[PDB]
């Protein structure tokens, strides 16, 4: 059942994918791999093709790998990127080597989107529904996206979206960088540990700019965005401080002068009132009290999309091995397993 492989040279990288992979064109590389957009004569779509790049250069690597192919292979949602195929020319574990990631290919993401046109509130409410569609489905298999953004989120001509590249250095996060921009507070600051309810925060950051067209946190680094943040929601109170572990972030949270959250009706002027209502629900300083993906899919605001029979949660997936402790060549087997069981959609 081994398809048949052709290789060939593109961009001083050498490209070794069946078949049924036609016209590849180079669209980009980085520290992960280089990338080719592909036309899939199975399926018919355009793809992307990715060869990671020393995938087991070390144990770090190795997970890392490892970890992205799991989460890939376990995501079956319309408003998530999920995996088309994967393959490796190696026809067994000691020549595996090198590992080929095909996802969809859906054209631009949200940064993109906003730069071409002017987004209606409609445009809005279908964008965000998406999100927080593909967010229960995430959710309900205990997975957090971790640094959900613009960038993230891929849109096509007809509005559709999907999540990509789930969270899997901080220097990326210094600065006046929208890296850091949609990131809950108390994960930027180490403040605790991170739920998913961290994502919902990073919807909020990002309706809010659909709907204004700014940033809403544009911090210049970690305690100016921090201020923008208490600013707009209020210091924190005697029992979102009791959860904070550090007694130093404690003291200094207790040294800023307290004040109370602003009225978002002031302050996203002229927007929807529906819409108004739910930012202030998902953007609340205490993520405990943060309005979860599933109740936000009810919320009136998405009343002209929302269908709770037309709203998946996913499988159960298992991180047990996040917690695990194995060589290089361990992890790399488990890869080897992953790519050879993959069952096609």
């Known amino acids: 059942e081994r398809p048949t492989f052709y290789r060939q040279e593109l961009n001083k990288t050498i490209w070794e994918v069946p078949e049924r992979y036609q016209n590849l064109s180079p669209v980009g590389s980085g520290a992960y791999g280089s990338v080719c957009a592909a036309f899939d004569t199975k399926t018919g779509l355009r793809v992307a093709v990715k060869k990671l790049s020393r995938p087991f250069q070390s144990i770090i690597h190795a997970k890392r790998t490892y970890r992205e192919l799991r989460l890939l292979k376990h995501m079956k949602h319309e408003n998530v ?16 080597n090198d590992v080929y990631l095909v996802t969809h290919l859906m054209g631009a993401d949200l940064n993109n989107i906003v730069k071409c046109q002017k987004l209606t509130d409609d445009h809005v409410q279908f964008l965000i529904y998406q999100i927080l569609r593909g967010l229960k489905y995430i959710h309900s298999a205990d997975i957090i996206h971790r640094d959900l953004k613009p960038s993230n989120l891929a849109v096509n001509e007809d509005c559709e979206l999907k999540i990509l590249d789930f969270g899997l250095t901080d220097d990326e996060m210094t600065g006046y960088v929208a890296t850091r921009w949609y990131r809950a507070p108390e994960i930027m600051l180490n403040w605790m540990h991170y739920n998913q309810t961290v994502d919902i925060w990073s919807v909020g950051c990002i309706m809010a700019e659909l709907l204004t067209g700014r940033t809403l946190f544009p911090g210049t680094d970690h305690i100016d965005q921090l201020k923008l943040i208490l600013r707009l929601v209020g210091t924190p109170g005697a029992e979102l401080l009791k959860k904070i572990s550090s007694e130093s972030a404690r003291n200094y949270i207790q040294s800023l002068t307290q004040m109370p959250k602003m009225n978002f009706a002031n302050v996203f002027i002229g927007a929807n009132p ?33 269908d709770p029979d037309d709203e998946p949660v996913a499988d159960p997936y298992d991180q047990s091995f996040e917690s695990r402790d194995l060589l290089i060549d361990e992890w790399k087997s488990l890869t080897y397993d992953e790519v050879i069981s993959f069952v096609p959609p």
């Not at 990127?81 to 595996?96: C, H, K, N, Q």
């Open 81 to 96: 990127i999920g995996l088309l195929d994967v393959f490796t020319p190696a026809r067994s574990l000691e020549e595996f």
């Open 274 to 306: 529906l819409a108004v209502d739910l930012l202030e629900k998902m953007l609340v300083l205490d993520s405990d009290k943060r309005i979860t993906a599933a109740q936000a899919l009810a919320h009136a605001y998405f009343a002209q999309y929302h």
